[PDB]
Design a protein around this ligand. Structure first.
Ligand SMILES: Nc1nc2c(ncn2[C@@H]2O[C@H](COP(=O)(O)OP(=O)(O)O)[C@@H](O)[C@H]2O)c(=O)[nH]1
Ligand SMILES: [Mg+2]
Ligand SMILES: [Zn+2]
Lengths: 385, 328, 250, 1045
């Protein structure tokens, strides 16, 4: 609406922008901000600095219609003022809702209905005006009275602050007291935990250490007792050794007394006469049976069990073979005497007897050269062992 | 034609004729609280516009106004005046609640500050003592744990030594029982051998029931016990070997038929041998005479059936046999 | 072996914060005597504090998206959030060395937070396989979890012997004896807890969800979509593209 | 000219003893790097460009690259010179400049004439005028020798620097041949005097005056062609003139590695760019794209503005269109960085930024992948300011306000679009980074109308408290920009956020109010309403809220007047403080003065109650009674409220906590409603055919003179080895039952073991000595053979003797594992002489007397001399606890049950007790009690002990044989104890009976009574073998080995 007497003031102005700034410091964009003087009273307005620009669109912000716009522009916080716009808003010309610049160093304002650049139905009744003015005046005077009240309250806040500074020091001291108290309390809880734990493991240390001392004590005393048992073991070992010497002395005494009774002898032809009988290598039956008893008793005296046990009879001395698989229950027993229809059985039986003689010599320790000599080998055994 | 506009609505104003009556009294009471640059109806309307501009300059509202706008903004100003009166009462109430707060004495607060500072400092030194105690506790913990682990190594060494000892001890107990078992076997066998005559072991003249057997062979045949000739001949053979050995031990003989080891006259002849043996002990050592008496030609044995007679003989020979062992 | 790629699991990463665990860096008395604000910190209430684990994903030094916070959970006995954070990253947003900085924050004062521990864990662990498991991470104390490559605050590396055989066991590479194995696993957790008790440090339990609309036994692996000439020409016949840039201007 | 296709790229195929000339040319130029002859009706690599086109193409051959192509034209003519090659028809249309500034001199045509007529131009038109541009560089001498080519190359360089302007026509050159013509007028189009003189020298009418290309390269060594070329860029670019680097990934790899060398050595950078960019379009893998992007980022500050805006930025966009989301984010980020490095505005970049770049980034702003929108949210706060800055720098070069408004509109549209994108995180990211700075791109009225409302929509999304906290984090910035026309819109919304469910949202909105008041963006009355409502949150159980409320209340104490601070902040703060503070502005004082919050348990039990309004009703009445407004405290209408109140009072809520639960009631119920709206086998080598032992000794070998204490059977070789304290470890043939004896190990010898899968035995000594014996008893010379092949001795102070041994063969490794007095079983790899596992024993258990290792090598059992057992898991070699002995008597022998997996037989000293313990259950679940002492009695009345165990899987019967100090060898049948019996002693030995009495749940077999072949001493061994019959092999402590058939 293009009428005049349309109220149009700074309060209607909330935008200020600048266009086409030509910089006196050569081709480089300033960092442009601006300041408004109360048109020349001290300026008060400062928009944020649009860095690296020359045509800014600064963010905006009172019933006065004239004011001074000046723009500072200079990079890196050192600034230079390049504007003088003493502009009465009433002198401005209207551009429609879009800032459009054609001059240089141009500044364009912005007001409620559009933008402003330097050119080239019934009303309230008068009773309503009186009511409105009296209400605005009541607002004015009550707000001013509240400002007076607030300034009085702040002046008394300062007057009491003269000692309230010491009061704030007291508050800080009590805070310090409280902070120290909590810190000491948590540190004392740490002390309590540590002390209880340490006391526990110290009693544990004394217990385990005394246990170790007792263990070493028992180790030494146990070694002592073991050495006593060592001397006892040596004593009984030697006692057994002499006992066994007595055993073998007796064994050979009775072995010789045994051995007399069953004679053996020689001839000029080196043969063995047995009670006077010729013996080629493996009566004859009687002397052989004597050998069988001779062997059995030698087993009985020397305590060496027969490989094949002998069910002894004088000449009918039998030898049982429990070991061979190839022999059945009736075949377990062989003779040492000539049995009817059992020549091979008898021969292997005398063989087993010779093996018993070999066993006796081996257990005594006498290596036997030939195992077909029955009586010569046993006679030799008695001669040597 | 439009002359004014609602400055808070942008709407035209039809001028209310009441202003035609307003005087200097009302108006007087109302009007009070680089480089660049830029007729009566008539008089009364121009005065109206001048007062409108003056009022926009005077106050923060822009006259003239709609009746809708005027009443709405009167509602807003009424709300704001209630708020302003409310806050005025608030600040008054705060004024008296501060005035009732007395101007406290600075000196009393001074001793308050000094006392509080002293208490805070004393608590500071108490916390310092607490830290000192923390240090001593931590040191004790460290050294006690070092001691415990030291004793752990001690335990390791003791365990190695104790293991060696116990191995040796258990092995020695095994060897101890071993020697003991060997000793027992040696003692038993030695005792049986020594207390046994070589002949007696060779020929065990011992009583089994109504027989006195030799090496556990029957001497004597009964109608109730089947005893073949082989059994009795083996028993006799051992009897004769016993008296041949007794010949070789004491030096005796019939000189016509000396009984060399064999196997009615036969054992009848043997009688004389034992008769000789009886005489031989009687001729040799009069200290013992044989129990079961003997007569040669009658072939007779007194209990001093045929099996019973023989049973006495080995019984008798046993008497002779025991004495023969003890003699030498 | 059943595995799916991380470029294919196009879901936001879920991260479970189970529990911060261990003896916290109890500052000396002088620390609060010089910092009275410390008095109100989360440390100085010996009740377990109201921490929250900002889990920011990183990759070759670049922060990859914003940090999440654990929804507020007041604690009294333990730091058991057990609570899932929906990471702003998706698995296809994770490259090979992408690593989550879990900064376990506490409150130091009005409007200011001071980290209490931060653990930088390779989300894609050794061999590239994603950390599909419940983890205990080291808690580099009072240092914000730094995700730079290499990590300043690594979360992980007797266990060096245990783990190889363990995976050989439950992946079938090894002998199975029921009672023996379970009793040994008891022994294994004894060793793990002894190791945990050994360190003064803090350790955090973390976990990774694995819930997809598929047969749910699958591992996540970092993957991505893949002589006439004498002088090779890397632009043999293609668009002169600066030309187009200029043509689009008037 | 036939441009065609080939498996690597395009190829030029041309058609007119002539075939031999190209053979010679190829064998000459195969090494040339800036030259390319016919590779073979002829063929040649297709290169990107000409010289003339490359002058014409939009990335213009700047003067440095013109100097470079002169450098390389001289170099190529030189290389043809040295290799004995001369083209004769150099031109601008044949100096083929490949994409990466590599100058190829192409198709050396020795079939062109050497000399020509002067008045006949047909030869020139055919041979030399292929383009029919009629610019003739035939040598003035010609109308083939080196100076001729040098003259042509000088003409070519002159054409290069004259922006395509021809230096000679045919008429010009003919007039030049007669000396009548001097073209210096065209020469004045050369930019720099160095090339002026270089062309002058090289174009002189007299050929001999012309230097050599090598000479000219020598001369122009810094006046024109900088030394940086000769040093770095000749061989470096020669790296890329070879066939290996076939693909752009590798060139990017090489240059990424060489970046530091190239930058610090080198301006030749432009030359490098022709390489790098030639790869940017064809990068294959994500690593390559990211590498090239960081390469470009590091190069850019050392390039100039024209270079960037021409040859880097369009490629950055080409990536921002590409697929990989990390590549998109990095393309936008590189784009932002590169454009940020810009500080000039070339003529053709007059309006780049609105017209080119922002359209290119729009589809990123929409893009689906979250990271792309996150990147755009973080990066628009810099792309937009690059826009404004750039279009401001432009005016140094149309209606500017229209351009600015267009920019503001695109920025505004993008901000709103990103606040509409569904992801709460993209919204939050934009609100963290760009919302504050893009408000300036709005202007108030548009901002208040669009951005503030769009932000407000997030406070509706109750599920994700992160988005609402983000709203409160950037609401400070927007309510700063929009200013005073949004406080009335926001005040109820901030009250909504404060009373919200998730308490960290309360924290973030307390910070919102903190900063927003700190800018003075709140109505004074609204400041008081918010302070009165944040009063309760000081005593909130939470700590982040409690502290944030402290922060806000301090901040308001600092922004608004101390008059206001008192008058309204203090009376709102009276409840939740403890002390009448003065310095609200001291956070110190406030935090040290807040009351302890209502316990989180009390507070949650107040919130949890449904219909919590009645809870507050009864609480409110309780307050009135506690102040006297009601005479008493009656129970409520609903006894459920009395019930809840009584439960919570059982927590002992202080009456002060009751007052506080009243004070928070507003937040309390609002939050309540908000959440309301929300090959091995135990079977040994012998399978036993000897079901019943006979008790029958076939051998009485007394060869040993001291106690015999170990027997090991081996049926690999049909031997059995025994050892005795006489130190004679005798190996006895089984077929003969001493086939061999051995005493060199010395001392008492009671331990040994045969190896299961070899030809050698192993023995152990009391010395601590472990040895072997190679055995030869199958082969038969006049005597079999012993073979000592081992040595191992251990100090008893640390390693120890051998308590028992056992050899098992677990693969390539062959393990012989032995006990020690120290008890650490050790597994020696006889196949490798280095041991495998040292199973250390807990010496507190005591000396280990027997061990027995699983057949499948899973677990090995240990029995201490204390009777306390042990078990080991050898897959991890981890210990496992084991049940002790009730009597704690020495365990002599241990074994692993045949039928049972986890069943460990221990023969314990005393009472002839042999107990079967199961390790999985940790208790004894079978027992043998031979001694007539009280069953399972710990009195240990009997000295008798058992130490020979043979356990066998015979006919499904775990046939056991135990032998010990009683001189008796006992058979047991672990299923039918009626079968058990003794095989020893003489006929006078009384018979016994074998009972089954179940005691304590455990089972007890018991033995009780109704020439001596048996060992006269302790039978300390039992083993078994067979050849035809099964043999037990036993030994005594007298030294006698016997074998029972
Ligand atoms: N841009 C470009 N143009 C080529 C290429 N190969 C041949 N040409 C054109 O083909 C013509 C070949 O003729 P020219 O070299 O002058 O004489 P020629 O000896 O017969 O080949 C040149 O004028 C170029 O314009 C190439 O690889 N790239
Ligand atoms: Mg060509
Ligand atoms: Zn109006």
């Amino acid at each position: 609406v293009e009428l005049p007497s349309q109220q149009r003031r700074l309060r209607h102005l909330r935008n200020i922008a600048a266009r086409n700034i030509v910089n006196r410091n050569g081709h480089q964009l300033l960092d442009t901000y601006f300041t408004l003087h109360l048109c020349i009273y001290k300026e008060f307005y400062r928009s944020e600095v649009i860095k690296n620009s020359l045509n800014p669109t600064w963010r905006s912000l009172t019933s006065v219609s004239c004011f001074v716009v000046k723009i500072w522009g200079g990079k890196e916080n050192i600034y230079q003022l390049l504007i003088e716009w003493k502009v009465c808003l009433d002198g401005l010309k209207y551009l429609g809702q879009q800032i459009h610049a054609r001059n240089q160093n141009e500044i364009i304002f912005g007001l409620n209905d559009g933008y402003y650049g330097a050119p080239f139905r019934n009303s309230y009744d008068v009773f309503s005006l009186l009511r409105l003015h009296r209400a605005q005046c009541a607002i004015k005077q009550t707000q001013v009275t509240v400002q007076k009240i607030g300034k009085e309250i702040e002046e008394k806040l300062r007057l009491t602050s003269t000692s309230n500074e010491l009061k704030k020091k007291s508050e800080c001291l009590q805070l310090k007291i409280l902070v120290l108290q909590n810190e000491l309390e948590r540190q004392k809880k740490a002390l309590g935990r540590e002390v209880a734990l340490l006391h526990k493991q110290q009693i544990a240390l004394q217990d385990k250490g005394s246990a170790f001392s007792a263990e070493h004590l028992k180790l030494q005393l146990q070694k002592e007792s073991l050495n006593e048992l060592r001397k006892e073991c040596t004593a009984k070992r030697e006692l057994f050794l002499k006992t066994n010497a007595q055993l073998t002395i007796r064994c050979r005494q009775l072995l010789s007394e045994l051995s007399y009774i069953y004679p053996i002898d020689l001839n000029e032809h080196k043969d063995y006469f047995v009670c006077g009988v010729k013996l080629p290598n493996s009566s004859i039956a009687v002397a052989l049976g004597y050998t069988a008893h001779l062997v059995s008793m030698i087993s009985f005296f020397l305590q060496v069990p027969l490989r094949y046990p002998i069910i002894h009879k004088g000449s009918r001395s039998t030898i049982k073979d429990n070991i061979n698989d190839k022999l059945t229950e009736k075949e377990r027993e062989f003779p040492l005497y000539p049995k009817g229809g059992e020549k091979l059985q008898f021969d292997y039986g005398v063989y087993l007897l010779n093996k018993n003689i070999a066993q006796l010599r081996y257990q005594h320790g006498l290596g036997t050269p030939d195992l077909r000599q029955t009586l010569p080998n046993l006679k030799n055994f008695m001669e040597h062992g | 034609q439009v002359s004014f506009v609602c400055q808070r609505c942008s709407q035209p104003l039809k001028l209310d004729t009441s202003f035609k009556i307003l005087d200097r009294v009302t108006i007087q009471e109302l009007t009070a609280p680089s480089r660049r640059f830029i007729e009566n109806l008539s008089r009364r309307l121009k005065v109206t516009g001048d007062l409108f501009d003056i009022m926009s300059g005077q106050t923060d509202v822009d006259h003239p106004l709609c009746e809708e706008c005027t009443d709405t903004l009167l509602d807003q100003l009424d709300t704001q005046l209630n708020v302003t009166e409310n806050e005025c009462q608030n600040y008054k109430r705060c004024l008296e609640i501060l005035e009732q707060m007395n101007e406290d004495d600075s000196e009393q607060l001074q001793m308050e500050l000094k006392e509080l500072a002293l208490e805070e400092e004393r608590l500071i030194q108490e916390l310092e003592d607490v830290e000192k105690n923390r240090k001593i506790v931590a040191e004790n913990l460290e050294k006690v744990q070092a001691e415990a682990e030291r004793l752990d190594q001690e335990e390791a060494q003791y365990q190695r030594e104790y293991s060696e000892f116990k191995r040796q001890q258990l092995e020695l107990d095994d060897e101890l029982k071993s020697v003991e078992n060997q000793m027992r076997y040696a003692q038993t066998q030695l005792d049986k051998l020594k207390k046994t005559n070589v002949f007696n072991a060779t020929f065990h003249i011992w009583h089994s029931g109504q027989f006195g057997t030799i090496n556990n062979f029957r001497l004597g045949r009964l109608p109730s016990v089947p005893v073949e000739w082989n059994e009795i001949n083996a028993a006799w053979g051992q009897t004769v070997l016993l008296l041949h050995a007794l010949a070789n031990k004491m030096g005796l003989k019939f000189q016509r038929y000396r009984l060399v080891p064999y196997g009615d006259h036969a054992m009848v002849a043997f009688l004389d041998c034992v008769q000789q043996f009886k005489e031989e002990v009687e001729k040799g050592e009069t200290r013992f005479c044989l129990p079961y008496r003997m007569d040669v030609e009658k072939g007779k044995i007194e209990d001093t059936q045929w099996t019973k007679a023989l049973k006495f003989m080995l019984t008798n020979l046993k008497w002779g046999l025991a004495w023969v062992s003890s003699q030498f | 072996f059943h595995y799916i790629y991380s470029c294919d699991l196009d879901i936001n990463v879920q991260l479970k914060i189970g529990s911060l665990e261990g003896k916290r860096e109890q500052k000396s008395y002088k620390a609060v005597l010089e910092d009275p604000m410390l008095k109100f910190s989360g440390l100085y209430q010996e009740t377990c504090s109201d921490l929250y684990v900002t889990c920011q994903v990183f990759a070759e030094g670049k922060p990859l998206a914003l940090p999440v916070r654990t929804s507020y959970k007041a604690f009294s006995t333990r730091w058991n959030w057990n609570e899932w954070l929906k990471l702003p990253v998706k698995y296809p947003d994770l490259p090979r060395n992408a690593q989550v900085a879990l900064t376990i924050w506490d409150v130091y004062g009005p409007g200011k937070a001071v980290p209490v521990g931060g653990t930088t864990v390779s989300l894609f662990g050794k061999y590239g396989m994603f950390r599909q498991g419940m983890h205990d991470l080291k808690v580099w104390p009072n240092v914000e979890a730094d995700g730079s490559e290499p990590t300043k605050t690594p979360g992980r590396t007797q266990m060096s012997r245990l783990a190889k055989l363990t995976k050989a066991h439950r992946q079938g590479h090894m002998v199975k004896v029921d009672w023996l194995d379970r009793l040994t696993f008891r022994e294994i957790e004894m060793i793990n807890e002894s190791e945990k008790r050994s360190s003064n440090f803090m350790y955090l339990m973390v976990e990774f969800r694995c819930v997809k609309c598929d047969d749910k036994e699958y591992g996540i692996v970092y993957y991505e979509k893949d002589e006439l000439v004498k002088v090779p020409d890397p632009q043999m016949s293609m668009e002169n593209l600066v030309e187009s840039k200029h043509h689009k201007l008037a | 000219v036939a441009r065609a296709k080939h498996r690597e790229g395009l190829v030029v195929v041309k058609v007119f003893s002539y075939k031999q000339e190209l053979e010679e040319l190829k064998i000459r130029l195969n090494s040339a790097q800036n030259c390319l002859p016919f590779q073979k009706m002829l063929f040649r690599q297709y290169v990107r460009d000409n010289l003339y086109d490359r002058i014409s193409t939009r990335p213009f051959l700047n003067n440095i690259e013109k100097r470079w192509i002169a450098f390389q034209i001289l170099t190529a003519v030189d290389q043809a010179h040295k290799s004995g090659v001369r083209h004769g028809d150099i031109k601008t249309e044949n100096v083929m400049v490949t994409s990466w500034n590599w100058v190829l001199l192409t198709d050396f045509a020795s079939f062109k004439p050497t000399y020509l007529p002067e008045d006949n131009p047909a030869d020139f038109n055919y041979f030399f005028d292929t383009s029919r541009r009629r610019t003739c560089y035939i040598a003035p001498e010609r109308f083939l020798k080196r100076a001729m080519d040098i003259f042509s190359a000088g003409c070519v360089i002159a054409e290069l620097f004259t922006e395509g302007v021809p230096l000679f026509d045919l008429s010009q050159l003919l007039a030049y041949r007669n000396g009548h013509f001097f073209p210096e007028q065209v020469l004045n189009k050369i930019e720099d005097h160095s090339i002026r003189e270089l062309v002058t020298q090289m174009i002189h009418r007299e050929p001999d005056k012309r230097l050599e290309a090598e000479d000219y390269l020598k001369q122009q060594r810094g006046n024109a062609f900088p030394e940086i070329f000769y040093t770095f860029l000749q061989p470096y670019m020669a790296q890329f003139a070879k066939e290996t680097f076939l693909s752009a990934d590798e060139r990017i790899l090489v240059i990424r590695k060489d970046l530091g060398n190239i930058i610090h050595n080198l301006n030749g950078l432009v030359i490098l760019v022709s390489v790098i960019t030639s790869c940017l379009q064809t990068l294959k893998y994500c690593d390559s794209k990211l590498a090239a992007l960081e390469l470009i980022l590091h190069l850019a500050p050392r390039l100039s503005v024209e270079i960037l805006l021409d040859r880097i930025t369009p490629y950055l966009l080409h990536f921002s269109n590409d697929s990989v989301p990390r590549v998109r984010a990095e393309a936008l980020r590189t784009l932002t960085k590169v454009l940020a490095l810009v500080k000039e505005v070339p003529r053709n970049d007059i309006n780049i930024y609105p017209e080119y770049i922002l359209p290119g980034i729009a589809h990123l702003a929409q893009d689906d992948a979250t990271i792309v929108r996150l990147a755009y949210a973080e990066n628009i706060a810099l792309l937009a300011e690059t826009a404004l800055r750039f279009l401001e720098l432009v005016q140094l070069k149309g209606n500017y306000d229209t351009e600015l408004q267009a920019l503001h509109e695109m920025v505004q549209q993008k901000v709103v679009t990103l606040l509409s994108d569904p992801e709460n995180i993209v919204k939050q990211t934009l609100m963290e980074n760009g919302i504050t700075r893009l408000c300036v791109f709005f202007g108030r009225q548009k901002a208040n109308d669009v951005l503030l409302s769009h932000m407000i929509t997030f406070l509706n999304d109750k599920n994700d408290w992160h988005l609402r906290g983000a709203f409160f984090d950037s609401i400070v910035g927007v309510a700063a920009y929009v200013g005073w026309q949004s406080s009335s819109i926001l005040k109820p919304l901030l009250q909504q956020g404060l009373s919200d469910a998730e308490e960290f949202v309360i924290v973030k909105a307390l910070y919102a109010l903190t900063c927003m008041c700190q800018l003075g963006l709140l109505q004074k009355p609204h400041v008081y309403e918010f302070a009165s409502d944040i009063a309760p949150f000081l005593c909130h159980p939470n700590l982040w809220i409690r502290y944030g409320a402290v922060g806000f209340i301090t901040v308001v104490a600092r922004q608004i007047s101390t008059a206001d601070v008192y008058c309204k902040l203090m009376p709102y703060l009276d409840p939740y403080i403890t002390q009448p503070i003065i310095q609200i502005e001291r956070k110190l004082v406030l935090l040290s003065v807040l009351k302890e919050p209502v316990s989180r348990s009390i507070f949650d039990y107040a919130l949890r109650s449904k219909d919590i309004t009645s809870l507050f009703r009864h609480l409110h009445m309780r307050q009135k009674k506690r102040n006297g407004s009601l005479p008493d405290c009656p129970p409520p209408e609903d006894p459920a409220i009395a019930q809840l109140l009584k439960k919570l009072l059982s927590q002992g809520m202080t009456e002060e906590e009751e007052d506080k639960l009243l004070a928070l009631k507003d937040f309390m119920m609002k939050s309540n409603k908000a959440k309301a709206n929300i090959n091995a086998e135990w079977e040994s080598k012998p399978p036993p055919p000897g079901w019943r032992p006979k008790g029958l000794l076939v051998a009485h070998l007394h060869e040993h003179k001291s106690a015999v204490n170990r027997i090991r059977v081996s049926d690999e070789h049909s031997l059995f080895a025994t050892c005795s304290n006489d130190g004679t470890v005798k190996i006895w043939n089984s077929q003969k039952m001493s086939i061999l004896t051995y005493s060199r190990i010395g001392g008492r010898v009671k331990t040994l073991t045969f190896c299961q899968g070899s030809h050698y035995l192993a023995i152990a000594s009391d010395n601590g000595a472990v040895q072997l014996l190679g055995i030869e008893a199958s082969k038969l010379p006049k005597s079999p053979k012993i073979h000592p092949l081992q040595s191992r001795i251990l100090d008893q102070k640390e390693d120890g003797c051998v308590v028992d041994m056992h050899h098992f063969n677990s693969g390539a490794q062959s393990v012989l594992a032995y006990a020690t007095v120290n008890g650490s079983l050790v597994g020696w790899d006889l196949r490798s002489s280095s041991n495998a596992w040292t199973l250390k024993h807990d010496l507190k258990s005591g000396l280990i007397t027997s061990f027995a290792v699983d057949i499948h090598q899973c677990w090995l059992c240990i029995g201490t001399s204390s009777g306390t057992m042990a078990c080991w898991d050898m897959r991890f070699q981890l210990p496992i606890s084991s049940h002790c002995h009730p009597s704690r008597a020495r365990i002599r022998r241990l074994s692993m049950h045949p039928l049972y997996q986890s069943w460990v037989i221990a023969a314990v000293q005393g009472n002839n007790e042999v107990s079967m313990w199961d390790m999985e259950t940790g208790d004894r679940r079978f027992t043998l009690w031979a001694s007539s002492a009280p069953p399972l009695s710990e009195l240990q009345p009997s000295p008798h002990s058992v130490h020979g165990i043979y356990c066998s899987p015979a006919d499904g019967n775990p046939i056991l044989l135990t032998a010990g100090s009683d001189m008796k060898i006992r058979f047991w049948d672990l299923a039918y104890p009626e079968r058990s019996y003794v095989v020893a002693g003489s006929t006078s030995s009384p018979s016994v009976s074998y009972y089954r009495k179940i005691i304590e749940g455990t089972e007890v077999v018991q033995e009780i009574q109704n020439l001596p072949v048996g060992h006269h001493d302790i039978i300390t061994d039992v083993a078994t073998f067979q050849t035809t019959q099964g043999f037990i092999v036993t030994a005594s402590r007298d030294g006698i080995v016997k074998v029972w058939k």
